[PDB]
Design a protein around this nucleic acid. Structure first.
Lengths: 207, 95, 147
RNA sequence: GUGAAGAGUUUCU
RNA sequence: UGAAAGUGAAUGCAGGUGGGAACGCCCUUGUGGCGUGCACCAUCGACCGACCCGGAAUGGAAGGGUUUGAGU
RNA sequence: UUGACCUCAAAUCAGGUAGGACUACGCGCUGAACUUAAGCAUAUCAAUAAGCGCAGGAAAAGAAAAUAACCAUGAUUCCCUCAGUAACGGCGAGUGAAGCGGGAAAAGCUCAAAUUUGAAAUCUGGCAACAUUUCUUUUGUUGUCCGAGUUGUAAUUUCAAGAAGCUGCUUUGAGUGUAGACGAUCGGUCUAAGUUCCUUGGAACAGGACGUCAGAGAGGGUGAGAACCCCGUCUUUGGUCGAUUGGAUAUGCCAUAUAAAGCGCUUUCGAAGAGUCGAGUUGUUUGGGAAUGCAGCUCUAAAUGGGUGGUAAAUUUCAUCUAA
């Protein structure tokens, strides 16, 4: 029975939990196996970069919308703006995401510059050796495997160090603005309904 | 666009652009050839017995009874009103 | 370790510290915290009041990301800026005023607790309390709302 | 499923 | 803090009182007088949230309370 | 009378295929009770034990009829966290996810719905020839004939699009040999060093003296504790076969290689899965709460239609996705 100090017990061990215990004694082995696998992948795909170029996106919540992270693939609009076909992007190592869309010119330009930087730093080996075609590089001799993020990393938004204080800032009432906006956001529908009902009733009385 | 976290148009203000047309969102549009095929199929077949009963009720002008019968036959009232509108169009085209 | 355990000291004592009368039988008062309303009531009502019953209204599918809003007080506002900015701006008169991005520091609302130095500052935050705004204005700074 | 009678634009026996 | 929408902690030396570690100064050898006073306890207040008010479309700012919180 | 078509038969017809075993992990069906609730029926044990069907080296899942409500994200899977939280529960005992975020790994796609109609361009089988092989054991090509197929086999399309068009933009795989290597490699190792003396002992591999090697003082055996007695251990190149365009100017050099794709402006169209969605009821299950999923029965859809947006209903908008 419960007779001791502390919070009441909450242990969820009323099933046969001992037959589904997951130990981690293979953690160093798994780490070594994954390292060996990625080393083998790097050797087999050399001199291609280990990690493909990824876009910069904003996380979808107010908890994280102030940060920038790596996306899945570049949108069709970004590829068209940068001058890369969707079929050639996969061949040259540019992921394509058909689901994402550019709702803002900021995100569109942010990813377009990334594609342009990747294209500028990219060496395209000719399909036939010694015959550089359209877009191929004539100086493929000095080609080596480099980190994509080492030249094109994901960058966070910078804050402004300082700026002069404005008279509009002096006269701004932040708390009053927040309270008024909060009240307006919920009562605007009621006010609009009241105006519509008043107009309908006035017209009906006129009839 | 107040540019705040509260209000009707809250959120950060950016340069909004026009999104491209999504081919998948075109679903639900009626094609000329699809409408022609459906009209031919309607001519080849007839009407379901519940559809005929609803049409008879509409002709009798028992609108509430026809709506109740259509709602019970098809489920939701939204589909009932759609069927009522379609059958009314069929009746007035016959007239 | 095992050699420092009380079990080693109990070797040779028949009852092993559990008594000769009551012994150490299996569960004699039930399993877990069962009986808190009938025979464990004298313990539940004395040490865990409010355990039994319903209070409040349910919220189906609660998601805490839209409700995320950690707070920072005024006395910690100047801590958020680096030391170099503090030396460059605190205690001196400048044409421009330093900007403290509370949201970038990792908070959603600015609360008014403690005092502020008599130097202007630009506080960028999603929310701010009324008392914090008064103290910032008294100190000479302004608060501009951000999304 | 298909038809014939009785009955206060419809279906009960 | 409230069920929640929400709101969200300095009148002052971050307050007053009593006991109080340690220290310092005087007595004049007494279980000594004075000055501060950490910790902790008791107590009177102040501030924040909730409740109940006056009540001076939307807002609850000064004014309050015999209260309440696992708060400052 | 016959032939053709359709349907249905028989053959020890020609060629194939399935069963069964293994069950740690995997995909499902079916399915308890002991036990806890200090009794006990809902609950719990447990969507478990037992029973049944079915695979692989992984299986399953998987490229949104997905989240979110944002400055928006973006196939699936797994780990941390979310979180013992939202929620469920004689609201008793107990049970209990998901979005976001960080990381591992990342890869996209294919049909049906189109009239090729200036030529079914498609495919299987028999026969013959010519090639090929992990291989006389394997895998194909060509020609001809017969069948399949118009109750639809091929080609461009799969919504991210795309077709009909309009006008200018560029034009590419397989045989040999060398150097460096890369799997098996094994003609196998240049692969280092005391078994000297004295004592004890049955035996020295013990003690002591004098030495030696060490990229080798891991281990084992030898008549007792052996780096130098033996196998070994450490270090370290090469005879061979094969993958041999896996690469390089893979050179060398055969024909791969003359018309298929390539982006561009402008319009017209843009076919998209039915007893399915959805509604009701019942049973089961779920944290899913006026139903989370599944199943039985009844009703039964539509084309800016339909699904989702976690409180039932009606109405008006908005966002996202495009099921069967």
């Amino acid at each position: 029975a419960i007779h001791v100090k502390g919070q009441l017990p909450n242990a969820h061990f009323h099933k046969d939990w001992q037959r589904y215990v997951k130990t981690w004694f293979n953690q160093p082995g798994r780490k070594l196996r994954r390292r060996q696998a990625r080393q083998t992948k790097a050797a087999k795909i050399a001199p291609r970069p280990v990690e493909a170029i990824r876009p910069a996106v904003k996380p979808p919540t107010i908890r994280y919308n102030m940060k920038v992270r790596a996306g899945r693939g570049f949108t069709l609009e970004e590829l068209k703006a940068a001058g890369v076909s969707r079929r050639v992007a996969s061949t040259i190592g540019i992921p394509v995401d058909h689901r994402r869309r550019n709702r803002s010119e900021e995100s569109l330009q942010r990813n377009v510059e990334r594609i342009k930087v990747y294209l500028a730093h990219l060496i395209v080996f000719p399909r036939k050796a010694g015959q550089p075609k359209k877009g191929d590089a004539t100086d493929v001799s000095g080609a080596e495997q480099t980190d994509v993020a080492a030249v094109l990393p994901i960058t966070q938004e910078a804050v402004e160090e300082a700026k002069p204080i404005t008279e509009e800032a002096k006269n701004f009432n932040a708390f009053s603005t927040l309270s008024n906006e909060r009240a307006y956001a919920r009562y605007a529908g009621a006010r609009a309904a009241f105006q519509k009902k008043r107009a309908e009733e006035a017209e009906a009385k006129k009839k | 666009a107040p540019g705040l976290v509260v209000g009707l148009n809250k959120g950060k203000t950016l340069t909004k652009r026009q999104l491209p047309e999504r081919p998948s969102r075109r679903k639900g549009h009626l094609s000329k050839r699809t409408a022609f095929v459906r009209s031919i199929v309607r001519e080849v077949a007839g009407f379901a017995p519940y559809e005929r009963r609803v049409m008879e009720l509409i002709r009798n002008s028992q609108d509430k009874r026809a709506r109740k019968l259509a709602k019970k036959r098809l489920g939701t009232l939204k589909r009932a009103k759609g069927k009522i509108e379609e059958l009314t169009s069929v009746i007035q085209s016959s007239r | 370790p095992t050699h420092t355990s009380k079990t080693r000291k109990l070797r040779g004592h028949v009852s092993a510290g559990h008594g000769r009368i009551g012994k150490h039988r299996k569960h004699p008062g039930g399993r877990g915290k069962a009986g808190g309303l009938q025979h464990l009531r004298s313990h539940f009502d004395k040490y865990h009041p409010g355990y039994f019953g319903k209070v409040g209204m349910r919220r189906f599918h609660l998601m805490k990301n839209p409700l995320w809003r950690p707070t920072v007080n005024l006395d910690r506002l100047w801590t958020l800026v680096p030391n170099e900015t503090r030396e460059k701006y605190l205690g001196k008169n400048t044409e421009v005023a330093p900007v403290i991005n509370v949201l970038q520091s990792g908070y959603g609302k600015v609360l008014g607790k403690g005092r502020l130095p008599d130097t202007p500052v630009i506080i960028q935050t999603r929310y701010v309390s009324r008392r914090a705004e008064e103290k910032i204005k008294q100190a000479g700074g302004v608060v501009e709302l951000i999304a």
